[model samples]
Target: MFKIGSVLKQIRQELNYHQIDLYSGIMSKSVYIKVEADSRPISVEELSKFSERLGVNFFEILNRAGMNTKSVNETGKEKLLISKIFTNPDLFDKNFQRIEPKRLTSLQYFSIYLGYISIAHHYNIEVPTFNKTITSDLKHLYDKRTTFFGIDYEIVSNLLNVLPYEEVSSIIKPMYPIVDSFGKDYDLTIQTVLKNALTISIMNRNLKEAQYYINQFEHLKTIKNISINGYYDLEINYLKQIYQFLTDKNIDSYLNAVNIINIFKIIGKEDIHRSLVEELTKISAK
Candidate 1:
């Protein structure tokens, strides 16, 4: 089946537009039905008409169909390189040269700044002078852009790692509506941002903020189309237990959270297990 068939069908359903209604003036009802079922190909003109009517980006429709457009391709490639340098800060200079061009898009520049700040943090280096500009740009990005792309979400998640609580809170304040509009397609990203929110809130010892993000995590689990994997399921529960410990400072809740981390170790998620262990140690000491 053509990937676009399912993609279009899902998007149309999410918009609550019936096939007859969505295509009445664009194409024949019978042909539109066939296109949705992948039994027939849609012409370029019809595709553009439907995309425009739906208020979706034309190139986005093609990209969702696994047809890579140049700008999206370049944006995607640049993000991957940034992510690579994020994990291995030692390669910053090498990969930095590769991604640097005479001209840079807003998305590319945002990613580059995030990568540099993250690497600096990893090395325990100070960047207070540059942080002023980053905070301004972060605020500008959220304020000026009505629509967000994949890189935008990535930037939001990573910013939690570097930004202060107040700045991060203001930016993420409007994110719920934006993320909800994207529907179940962004479930994983939603989970990711919430978990990162949880991390930052807990680190700052902000119980109210941590509990709010925890509530979102619980809400996400009830979403029917959002598939929850076992690892994530356990991770959420672990975080919940951590929240409980924060609330009461009880040993039982702390012990339960530790047990969950042990399960992560037993299941071969050594990286997660180790990280959680460190976080738990920090939390319990306070």
Candidate 2:
């Protein structure tokens, strides 16, 4: 979608109304000029008035501008998650120092969900499909195992419940194709699931959950077989791969990340120390 200004112009032309005609009584002449020029943020209140007067839904303007109402809602959640992830410098440093050895905790899994949420919000993609499946899987895992690599099942259950269901599900549906093509590796499967969950979470603006993923990464050293070198190497490679995918602006990356996170989760990593976090940080920096 283009900017609001372009949409404004198109709508005005479509209605056969001049700027002055539309703005004559609704706003001051100067305000109308600014609105037409896209030099100012239009308030929802004002937009509502405009829409009513023009016999159009206010969102139609936003839609034409390539913005979705869902994005607005999700952006709030993404910012919150980012703020939380950046909160513990010490934990962040330690996790980043040996990111590979750390597996994703439920919190980390949620972070991947949040990451995808951020991306989806930015791009205005429809929500994913895995939200329910992962939530169910996580809940079942928590119930069956009681603890997922030492993290509390209650916490995982609560976080999963908090997510927007449709958005989360949108992320999970793409995985069938990936697994179909590549065959299943348990670790990769968990990683993919978490990755997709994080994407939806981010898009939906659940930053606290996103930060939970990052913070959970601090516990990865406890997982067996995830040696420092192996962990770091895996993480670094994954980060590079995800970074490249995100940089290309591929919506599929959102799904890919979810599938990867789920794979790790199934294999017993309970921290959010995946390559995707590093990639998210990089993207934010740029």
- Highest TM-score: which candidate? 1
Please provide, for model 1 over 16-41, each residue's C-alpha lDDT reduced to its tens digit, 9 standing for 90 to 100: 87887677877788888888888888
Q: What is the lDDT of residue 120 in candidate 1?
A: 70
Please give the range of 10 consecutive residues that has the lowest summed lDDT in model 1: 176-185
* TM-score for all models, in order of appearance: 0.67, 0.30
lDDT per residue (tens digit) for residues 1-286 in model 2:
2467657767888999888767776789888888778886777777777777668778777776776443455434433444454553333333333322221333544444544433444445444443335456445434444213212322232334445545344333332222211211233333434444444445444555444333333333344442233443344334434544555667676556556655665766656545455545554544
**Cα lDDT listed for each candidate:** 0.72, 0.48
The runs of at least 3 residues in candidate 2 whose Cα sits more than 4 Å from the true structure, single-residue gaps closed, are 69-111, 114-286
